[PDB]
Amino acid sequence: NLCCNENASELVAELSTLYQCIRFPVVAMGVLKWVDWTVSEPRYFQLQPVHLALLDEISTCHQLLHPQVLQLLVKLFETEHSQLDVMEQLELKKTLLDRMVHLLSRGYVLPVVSYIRKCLEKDTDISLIRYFVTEVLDVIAPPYTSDFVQLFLPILENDSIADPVTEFIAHCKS
Amino acid sequence: LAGPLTPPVKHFQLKRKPKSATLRAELLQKSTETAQQ
């Protein structure tokens, strides 16, 4: 009823019942497809984005929906609008980077850092990767398994600041 | 039928809470406001 009513603020009104009800998995998938089609509209970020918050309930509370959420945000991390300038595009990209860092904190670490490596080697400017490292080393607690270092540190070779980067590189090479 | 679920391995203990959960609390404030309505 909520999704086909074409909801924003009314979502925040009944967000209580939502995060109560996203615990149902099928309902989580349904809201995911709804917010995908709403947010996949060209220039849906110039007008309310609360919808990106809901993935936080989904991915955190449902492990097997980690692949979908990242595989949603891979599209949204490539958002480009001439109306919302490259500053606002980078703002949304950094927001999505914080979402992807949270999803990394839930254990979906190999494909996150692999795609981050791929888009840096491609698209994703060094500013976005530096902000990724900033948020990561601001949130991730040691020890750091080498399965994560093997992709995070050899792409962090480009920069040395966010100092936490020096601590991370020294700990993960020693 | 589809077999058991295996929880993911925790490579490290979280020294803090993610900012996502902080935003969940931030929006739970307006949730309580709607409860007041």
Query: Of A14, A16, A60, which is closest to B20 when you measure between CB atoms?
Result: A60
Cα separation, A67 vs A52, in Å, equals 16
- Asked whether the beta carbons of A102 and A56 are under 8 A apart, the reply is yes
Cβ–Cβ below 8 Å for A141 and B14: yes
Cβ–Cβ below 8 Å for B30 and A15: yes
The pair of structure tokens assigned to A71 is 């595989």
DSSP 8-state code for residue A64:
G
The technique is cryo-EM
On whether any CB of chain A is under 8 Å from the CB of B4, the answer is no
Q: In A40-109, which residue ranges form alpha helices assigned H by DSSP?
A: 51-61, 66-76, 86-105
Which of B24, B27, B32 to mutate to test binding with chain A, by most A CBs within 10 Å of its CB?
B27
Cα separation, A88 vs A150, in Å, equals 32
**What resolution does the deposited structure have, in angstroms?**
2.7
**What residues in chain A have their Cβ under 8 A from chain B's Cβ atoms?**
12-16, 19, 53, 56-57, 60, 63, 98-99, 102, 105-107, 109, 139-145, 148
Separation in Å, CA A21 to CA A36, A69, A112, A133, B30:
18, 18, 27, 34, 17
- Asked whether the beta carbons of A146 and A120 are under 8 A apart, the reply is no
Neighbours of A123 (CB within 10 A): 10
**Nearest chain A Cα distance for residue B14, angstroms:** 6
Spatial neighbors of B29 by CB under 8 A, at least 6 apart, are none
- Asked whether the beta carbons of B9 and A136 are under 8 A apart, the reply is no
Cα separation, A144 vs A72, in Å, equals 26
Question: Which among A134, A106, A65, A161 is positioned nearest to B12, based on CA atoms?
Answer: A106
The pair of structure tokens assigned to A112 is 């996150």
The pair of structure tokens assigned to A170 is 């020294």
